């Protein structure tokens, strides 16, 4: 106890690195939608 947990943590450590600096690609806003015909409501 208190030695197995440390040993397991080091053995279970170490490609997902370039995905951190990309941040978020803002957001998308559309120009509404065309209200075509042929619809009851």
């Amino acid at each position: 106890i208190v030695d197995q947990i440390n040993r397991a943590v080091s053995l279970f450590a170490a490609s997902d690195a370039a995905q951190a600096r990309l941040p978020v690609p803002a957001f998308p806003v559309a120009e509404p939608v065309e209200d075509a015909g042929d619809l009851d409501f």
Binding site: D3, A8, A17, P23
Partner: protein
């Protein structure tokens, strides 16, 4: 159960007997272990292995590793093994190991004893025991008996075998541990790489280390039971173990043994070593050896003293060895020979006297009747004994003749007609003779065995038909020192109380020309009354043990006035006639009573102190028939026997307060050496006669006859030696009689003159063959004559040498004779350098040669500068001694010495002038000697002055003043915590910060230290006499009205109720300490009660100390008011005027009352001014000044009251003091330690238990503890024997250039508590060790940087019901206890206590402590802690706020001893029992003991674990828990987590391994740029963002730099409020103003987790949140549904700081926060608009949000403290919010949080590393990340869930931590 040990099953009991019996006739065969080896080589290998794997164990086990249970036995008990490896190889030279026979077991030559001992450990459980081994010895001796010496060395060989087995086990366990760690490394490497080809390579590489059983135990378990497992390593390992017929179950059972067996064997070895060490062997040897069976019948050998029994055994062994005969038949023949010699004895009607043929005068007859071959050395000794005194003088004369021949041949080139050379050589060769005698003494000591006498062993005291009178010959010209004389008599009686012994004092007052002054009788009357009082104190069985005799001063001739018949010789003769009955003696009526028989008289002396049980040993030796004089009928000479005994006398170290450097010059060997028993005497080992100096016991009949029949008249001080000429004086050289050495040089000159006066009237006794004198006696007088004439001969030889020629070459001459003196003492040191012809290899025994080299140089210098004075004194002495009875005639200054001597300078100048005229070349050598000689009185006065001692120190006055004022400040504890509330006892503990409470527990040590502190304070002049007596009354009444167990105390007691807290456990040490303190207090009470006249004035010094205290405290007044400081300089002028007035008063020696009245007026005026300035300045510090002035004016009032005593009606006071003295002494002596004595291992039990009436298990075995003080009482009371003192402790450890006493947990109080009470001496080992301890403590403090003071204290750590705890501390260098360097706790009181040896350094350390906040209202605090693990923020050290009673008492005692030159050590020693037991002290420092063997100190201290994550984005996630006892929260490395309060949670959180986006979040948005990101690193994470995360205890830190900006987040949990806080701090770098906005996000969910996770919409709907007036706190709480929900109102606030007053921005609608189609990773709230329209109410998706725009300036920092609160109801959230709405408020709660986290940490046995490991376990226990779960194949056919309910496990909300034992 095998390993590499020596195991031979187990024989239990009654099988050992017949086993050894079979071994006797049929042995050898085979042994469990055993092989051919060399004993010395094997022992060296064992020692090397122990050092190797002890250094290995030291360098390991501290870096962090598992330790087997068989390893810590070698670690913690290394002193036992390092002492056990000794003795062996020290008791076995190359001769003792060869003379014993051998059994040749197995073909190899094997001695019998260790062959037998081999099976003792083999056939048993490796545990030694007396009964089993005695049974084995008896069984072996059933057929063939053992021999003397063979039976002796059983423990040694047993220890050798035991340490060999220990080495085997140690190396085996080291190898097993190394294999285990290697297997762990290999399996970790295998599991790290998923490939399979490399696994085969690794297996084929490690195949060389698989056959060992201790490699697959961890390996196979790790493969089978792990996380990832394998399928290829097992396929190889199982096949390999199945091959070679080994399988796997055998391996899996192998580790079940060989480890528990190892632990059991190691523990058994340790216990066996302890049992061998502590248990005795003399009684075992007596009860086991078959030789003693023969000699325990028909003879008194069973009671003949242990040493004489040893001599008998040694003689028997020597006779049996050389002579071809067995020892049993030799003993039988000796017994028959003794029987055939007739009884011839009064008391010897029964038994048989056996010594007459063994050590008697029939040794030669037995050796010739048995066929013994004497040794060549024995032949030489016998021949030279037959050659009488001629053989004594032959080497001396031969060496002198060689010396004169050599000097004559060397000085054969001088000229002159050769008429002076012969006389010159004859008068010169005195120092050559002295050197020859010294060389002869050295040779005989090195070769000739010292002679020891034989005597009885009076275990029951002196029996009937043996009565001894101890008579001290002195005078009663003592108006006051008659009390000293009776005290000396009482001490002498207390030395040897048991037996039929009586004590008498004989007197003859001064020397007056008349007969009687007709007044001395009344002067005697007081004496005859005083002794009568002593009789009332000692009258047992109607027996009077005290007598007085007085002479009548009959006129004889002249000069000496009227001495009766003669001097003290005549007095002793008159006593001799009186004892046998003489009615007409020249004595006085009334005081002429003799106690009947008393056939034996002891003389002793005035200043000599009688050693414990000394004369009792002398009485037996005298009474033994061998040592009984027979009175030769032809002449009163006594051919054989001894009528005079003289024990050796060695000077004491010091003489109390009189200890000058002159003492440490003319006497080096000072004290008693327990190691040595017999000192080789040339005159006794070769001639069997000694010189009687007048201090010894003697008979009456033979002594009286031989003294009366030969002496006519003319006897002087030398007659004592003449007595040896008429008897046979034997030097015992076995019993010590200490004697003080005078310090003044004048006293030494007077004593030398007196000794030399008597040595020159014996010339008729030498030159005349008539009268009667021993043949060697003439040689004794010749030796005395030459020893007296040496200085005159030296002076004459030197002056004539530079008078005749002295051209050049005689210069070399003045170099040679001065070398001769150098020969005289240094040859003695030759006995200390020869290692007995390098028989063995010594250990680190040091050299210390410089000390005695410097001592010899100083002695030679003093001798050469006093040559002229000694020559003048001897010349005048011999002239007087011849002019009388040969011509028929019959303190101060340097000016005093000059006028007294007036001889050496004038004579030296005359000689120099007379010699320098002829030749005119003899001045170049004469001038230095003459100038050195004329200055002799100057160096004489310089050396006669007393130097600095253990009591008197050069402390100047400023240091003393500072110590006195510190003590006065400290005494506030006793002043304010002793009350007449039925307590009268100081509380043990006092808190002052954490709501201070007064403790209600008191210990006897506390009572004693309080009592002695009261005595010291009264001596200081701080309180009135009446107050002191009242306090003594209260303390004594409380003590007597207290529960006791056979006088003892139950340690802890209540104060208000005076009951026992817990079990009534008696403490042995505390009772002894209290008894010693009570003894000292009673002695002091008697001291001021015998004359209560001058003690009533007062010291008149304490008021000056408190005035100085006021002066110092006034400098701390912050006088910076609007009206300047007028009152300040008013007050200072008043105080300096008061100081001047008191200085003038104390300058006056008449002590005018009007002066002290005016002083009181000034004091009260100063108090009024202080009150005036205080009530105007509302400060918390001026109250201290005002109360100090008030206490000052009570002190002045008390001094006035003590100055107003009537001094007339003092009898009630005197009788009260007498009654208190008697009651205190009776209470102290009512102690009973006898029932606490363990008569199995000696020593003392730790305590007694009132439950089952059982003793404690442990004992005290160290001479470096306070128990020593108790031991003194244990000997003072007389309830313990003397060997108990010598059978414990006395261990030395190397450090520096010397060795120090080893102490368990080596703090300073172990070395300071004893000397605080009784008196030590400079020459003792105790004072030297204390000085060392101080020096090394300062060195350790310097190395650690922090000031020293490591002692008993309270480490800065709390617990429930705050008490700061209490434990022991020490230094690892001198502690013998692992775990001392990890604390580094500094206690200021240790510096005060260690002030008796270095006041300046102690004061400097105290000032260094004063530079920090180590001072409080009640003087100094408890201690200060420097341990990083117990220090908050960036502070360097933390001061523990405790006050202790015993610490303050120790400080007061130490300062009183320093200021008053150890007054306590004197008053404690003012009891006769203390002087009786003091000779057990004194001892002798050794400098030759077998010393043992041993920036790292800075790193040795415990350091807290700082878990820091470099980049919490690409590494594995890290989590941390925070708790408040009722409120818990989760913080992840990315900033996620939750918040739980009493089961139910607050913030929603789900365990998503891939998302991890739940919790309270902080967002930072730029205004101009429009960019936004997060304070943590998860949702946004813009480019750059150099971030880091710190998870330490209590607080959590998230730091992030984005370039030009640094943002830090501090997450904390509140104390006693159930709140959480987040400090966001933004600091700029560039010089540009920037706009930023903060946002807080958290979703409130008040539910028990499952309820929200089941149907979230209910939890969303049942939330009512709103914003109140002055909007910055948003509150929320569930709407009331039923009558059973709590409600748990929560709230969130921003608490803006470092900014203007601006409105907040809130939004409680997540629909308008997210954007209906987005996530937290991209929210619509950070767009260009829709900025928190502030909608509140019953929102379907309630959240808590707070926005504030903050303008961070250029260069500085801005912080905002977000807070969240949860409370059971709404009526109490207001006080929590207002508690945090106050500015700052981040401190105060922070330190409280740290303290409570420490409380929680220490409430369980958890370490910081253990806490980190537990959090790492929790990260897997909570998150469904399973990196340590079961195997994939194992988990693929199990986990049916419903089956877990059979074990009564809920398995609903349970991570289920499994563990397999």
């Amino acid at each position: 159960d095998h390993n590499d040990s020596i195991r031979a099953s187990y024989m239990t009991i009654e099988e050992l007997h017949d086993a050894g019996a079979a071994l006797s006739r049929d042995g050898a065969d085979s042994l469990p272990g055993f092989m051919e080896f060399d004993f010395f080589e094997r022992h060296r290998e064992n020692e090397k292995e122990i050092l190797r794997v002890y250094r290995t164990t030291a360098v390991d086990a501290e870096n962090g590793a598992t330790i087997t249970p068989a390893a810590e036995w070698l670690l913690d008990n290394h002193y036992v093994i390092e002492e056990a490896i000794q003795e062996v190889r020290r008791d076995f030279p190359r001769k003792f190991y060869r003379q014993l026979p051998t059994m040749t077991v197995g073909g190899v030559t094997i001695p019998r004893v260790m062959a037998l001992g081999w099976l003792y450990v083999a056939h048993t459980h490796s545990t030694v025991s007396r009964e089993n081994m005695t049974a084995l010895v008896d069984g072996y001796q059933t057929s063939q008996t053992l021999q003397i010496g063979e039976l002796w060395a059983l423990p040694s060989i047993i220890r050798f075998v035991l340490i060999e087995n220990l080495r085997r086990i140690s190396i085996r366990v080291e190898r097993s541990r190394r294999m285990r760690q290697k297997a762990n490394e290999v399996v970790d490497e295998i599991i790290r790489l998923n490939d399979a080809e490399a696994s085969a390579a690794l297996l084929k590489q490690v195949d060389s280390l698989v056959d060992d059983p201790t490699f697959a135990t961890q390996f196979l378990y790790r493969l089978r039971n792990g996380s990832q497992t394998s399928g290829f390593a097992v396929a190889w390992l199982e096949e390999r173990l199945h091959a070679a017929g080994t399988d796997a179950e055998n391996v899996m059972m192998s580790e079940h043994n060989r480890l528990a067996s190892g632990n059991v064997t190691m523990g058994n070895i340790v216990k066996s070593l302890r049992e061998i060490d502590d248990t005795e062997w003399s009684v075992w040897f007596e009860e086991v050896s078959h030789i003693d069976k023969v000699l325990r019948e028909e003879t008194d050998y069973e009671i003949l003293d242990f040493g004489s029994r040893n001599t008998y055994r040694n003689t028997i062994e020597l006779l049996a060895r050389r002579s071809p005969r067995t020892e049993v038949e030799v003993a039988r023949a000796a017994v028959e020979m003794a029987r055939s010699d007739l009884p011839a004895g009064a008391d010897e009607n029964h038994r048989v006297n056996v010594g007459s043929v063994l050590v008697g005068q029939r040794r030669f007859e037995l050796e010739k009747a048995l066929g013994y071959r004497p040794l060549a050395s024995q032949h030489i000794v016998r021949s030279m004994r037959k050659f009488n005194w001629l053989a004594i003088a032959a080497p001396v004369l031969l060496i002198t003749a060689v010396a004169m021949l050599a000097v004559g041949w060397f000085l054969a080139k001088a000229g002159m007609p050769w008429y002076v050379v012969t006389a010159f050589l004859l008068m010169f060769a005195l120092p050559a003779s002295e050197g020859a005698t010294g060389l002869f003494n050295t040779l005989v000591t090195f070769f000739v065995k010292p002679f020891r006498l034989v005597g009885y062993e009076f275990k029951n005291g002196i029996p009937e038909d043996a009565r001894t009178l101890v008579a001290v010959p002195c005078m009663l010209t003592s108006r006051d020192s008659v009390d000293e004389m009776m005290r000396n008599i009482e001490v002498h009686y207390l030395a040897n109380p048991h037996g039929e012994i009586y004590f008498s004092l004989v007197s003859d007052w001064r020397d007056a020309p008349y007969e009687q002054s007709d007044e001395d009788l009344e002067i005697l009357d007081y004496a005859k009354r005083e002794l009568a009082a002593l009789n009332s104190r000692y009258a047992f069985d109607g027996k009077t043990r005290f007598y007085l005799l007085h002479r009548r001063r009959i006129y004889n001739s002249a000069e000496e006035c009227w001495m009766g018949w003669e001097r003290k010789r005549g007095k002793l003769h008159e006593l001799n006639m009186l004892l046998r009955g003489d009615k007409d003696t020249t004595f006085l009526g009334g005081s002429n009573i003799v106690p009947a028989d008393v056939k034996y008289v002891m003389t002793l002396d005035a200043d000599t102190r009688l050693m414990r049980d000394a004369v009792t040993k002398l009485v037996g030796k005298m009474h033994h028939p061998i040592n009984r004089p027979k009175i030769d009928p032809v002449s009163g000479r006594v051919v054989e026997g001894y009528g005079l005994l003289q024990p050796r006398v060695t000077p004491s170290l010091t003489t109390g307060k009189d200890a000058s450097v002159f003492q440490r010059v003319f006497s080096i060997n000072r004290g008693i050496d327990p190691y040595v028993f017999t000192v080789s005497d040339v005159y006794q080992d070769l001639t069997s006669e000694g010189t009687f100096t007048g201090k010894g016991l003697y008979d009456v009949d033979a002594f009286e006859a031989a003294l009366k029949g030969r002496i006519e008249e003319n006897s002087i001080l030398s007659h004592d030696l003449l007595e040896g000429s008429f008897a046979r004086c034997a030097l015992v050289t076995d019993v010590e009689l200490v004697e003080d050495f005078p310090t003044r040089y004048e006293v030494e000159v007077s004593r030398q003159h007196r000794w030399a006066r008597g040595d020159w009237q014996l010339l008729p006794f030498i030159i005349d063959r008539a009268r009667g004198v021993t043949a060697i006696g003439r040689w004794k007088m010749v030796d005395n004559l030459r020893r007296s004439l040496t200085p005159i001969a030296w002076f004459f030889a030197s002056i004539l040498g530079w008078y005749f020629m002295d051209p050049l070459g005689a210069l070399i001459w003045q170099i040679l004779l001065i070398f001769s003196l150098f020969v005289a003492p240094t040859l003695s040191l030759l006995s200390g350098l020869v290692p007995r012809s390098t028989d063995i290899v010594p250990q680190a025994h040091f050299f210390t040669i410089w000390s005695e080299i410097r001592a010899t140089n100083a002695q030679v210098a003093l001798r050469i500068v006093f040559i002229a004075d000694a020559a003048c004194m001897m010349t005048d002495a011999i002239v007087r001694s011849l002019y009388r009875l040969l011509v028929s005639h019959k303190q101060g200054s340097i000016v005093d010495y000059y006028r007294q001597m007036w001889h050496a300078p004038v004579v030296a100048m005359l000689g120099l002038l007379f010699a320098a005229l002829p030749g005119d070349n003899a001045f170049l050598i004469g001038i230095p000697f003459t100038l050195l000689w004329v200055l002799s009185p100057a160096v004489a006065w310089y050396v006669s002055q007393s130097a600095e001692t253990e009591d008197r120190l050069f402390v100047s006055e400023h240091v003393s003043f500072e110590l006195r004022k510190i003590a006065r400040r400290t005494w506030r504890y006793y002043e304010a915590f002793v009350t007449p509330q039925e307590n009268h006892l100081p509380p043990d503990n006092f808190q002052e910060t954490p709501e201070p409470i007064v403790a209600s527990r008191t210990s006897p040590t506390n009572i004693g230290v309080y009592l002695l502190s009261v005595i010291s304070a009264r001596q200081f002049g701080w309180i009135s006499f009446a107050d002191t007596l009242e306090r003594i009354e209260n303390t004594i009444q409380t003590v007597e009205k207290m529960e006791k167990h056979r006088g003892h105390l139950y340690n802890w007691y209540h104060t208000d109720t005076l009951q026992t807290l817990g079990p009534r456990y008696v403490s042995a040490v505390d009772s002894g300490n209290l008894a010693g303190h009570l003894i000292a207090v009673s002695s002091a009470c008697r001291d001021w009660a015998e004359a209560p006249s001058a003690h009533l004035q007062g010291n008149l010094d304490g008021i000056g100390d408190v005035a100085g205290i006021l002066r110092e405290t006034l400098k701390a007044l912050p006088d910076n008011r609007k009206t300047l400081r007028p009152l300040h300089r008013r007050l200072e002028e008043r105080i300096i005027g008061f100081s001047n007035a008191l200085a003038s008063v104390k300058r006056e020696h008449e002590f005018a009352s009007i002066r002290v009245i005016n002083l009181a007026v000034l004091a009260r005026d100063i108090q009024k001014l202080a009150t005036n300035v205080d009530h105007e300045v509302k400060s918390a510090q001026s109250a201290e000044v005002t109360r100090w002035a008030q206490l000052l004016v009570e002190s002045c009032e008390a001094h006035i009251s003590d100055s107003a005593i009537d001094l007339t009606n003092m009898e009630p006071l005197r009788q009260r003091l007498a009654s208190l003295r008697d009651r205190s002494r009776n209470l102290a002596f009512s102690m009973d330690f006898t029932f606490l004595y363990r008569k199995d291992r000696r020593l003392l039990s730790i305590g007694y238990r009132v439950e089952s009436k059982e003793l404690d298990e442990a004992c005290y075995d160290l001479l470096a503890s306070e128990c020593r003080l108790t031991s003194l009482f244990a000997i003072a009371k007389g309830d313990l024997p003397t060997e108990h003192w010598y059978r414990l402790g006395r261990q030395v450890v190397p450090i520096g250039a010397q060795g120090a006493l080893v102490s368990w947990s080596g703090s300073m109080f172990e070395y300071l508590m004893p000397p605080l009470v009784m008196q030590e001496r400079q020459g003792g080992i105790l004072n030297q060790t204390n000085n060392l301890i101080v020096k090394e403590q300062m060195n350790h403090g310097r190395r650690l940087g922090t000031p020293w003071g490591i002692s008993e204290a309270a480490f800065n750590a709390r617990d429930h019901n705050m008490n700061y705890q209490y434990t022991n501390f020490g230094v690892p260098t001198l502690g013998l206890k692992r775990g001392l360097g990890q604390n580094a706790v500094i206690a200021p009181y240790a510096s005060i206590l260690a002030s008796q040896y270095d006041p300046d350094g102690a004061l400097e350390n105290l000032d260094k402590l004063r530079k920090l906040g180590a001072l409080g209202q009640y003087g100094f605090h408890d201690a200060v802690d420097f341990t990083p693990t117990r220090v908050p923020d960036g502070k360097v050290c933390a001061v523990v706020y405790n006050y202790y009673a015993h610490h303050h008492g120790m400080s007061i005692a130490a300062v009183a001893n320093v200021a008053f030159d150890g007054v306590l050590r004197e008053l404690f020693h003012s009891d006769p029992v203390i002087e009786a037991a003091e000779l057990l002290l004194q001892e002798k420092a050794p400098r030759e003991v077998p010393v043992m063997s041993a920036g790292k100190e800075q790193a040795d201290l415990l350091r807290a674990e700082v878990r820091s994550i470099a980049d919490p984005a690409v590494r594995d996630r890290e989590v941390v828990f925070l708790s408040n006892g009722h409120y818990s929260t989760m913080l992840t490395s990315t900033g996620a987590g939750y918040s739980k309060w009493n089961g139910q949670a607050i913030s929603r959180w789900k365990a998503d391994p891939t998302d991890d986006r739940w919790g309270t979040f902080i967002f930072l948005r730029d205004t101009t740029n429009g960019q936004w990101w997060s304070a943590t690193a998860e949702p946004r994470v813009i480019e750059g963002e150099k971030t880091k995360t710190i998870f330490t205890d209590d607080k959590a830190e998230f730091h992030k730099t984005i370039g030009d900006l640094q943002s830090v987040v501090e997450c904390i949990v509140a104390t006693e409020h159930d709140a959480e806080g987040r400090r966001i701090t933004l600091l700029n770098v560039g010089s540009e103003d920037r706009y930023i906005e903060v946002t807080s996000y958290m979703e409130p969910v008040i539910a028990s987790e499952d309820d929200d996770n089941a149907h979230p919409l209910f939890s969303r709907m049942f939330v009512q949140t709103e914003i109140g007036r002055r909007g910055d706190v948003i509150r929320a709480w569930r709407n009331r549904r039923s009558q059973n929900e709590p409600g748990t109102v929560i709230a969130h606030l921003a608490a803006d700081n470092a900014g203007p007053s601006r409105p907040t921005e809130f939004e409680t609608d997540r629909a308008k926060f997210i954007g209906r189609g987005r996530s937290l990773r991209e929210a619509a709230a950070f767009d260009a608009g829709a900025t928190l329209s502030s909608s509140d109410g019953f929102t379907l998706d309630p959240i808590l949000s707070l926005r504030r725009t903050v303008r961070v300036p250029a260069g500085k920092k801005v912080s905002v403290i977000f807070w969240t609160i949860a409370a059971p109801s709404r009526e109490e959230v207001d006080k929590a919010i207002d508690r945090y709405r106050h500015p700052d408020a981040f401190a105060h709660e922070l330190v409280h949080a740290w303290t409570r986290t420490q409380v929680q940490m220490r409430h369980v046995g958890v370490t910081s590393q253990q806490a980190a490991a537990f959090q790492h376990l929790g990260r897997y226990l909570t998150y469904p990340d399973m990196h340590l779960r079961a195997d994939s194949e194992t988990l693929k056919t199990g986990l049916a869930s419903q089956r877990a309910l059979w074990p009564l496990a809920i398995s609903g909300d349970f991570p289920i931590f499994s563990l397999r034992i």
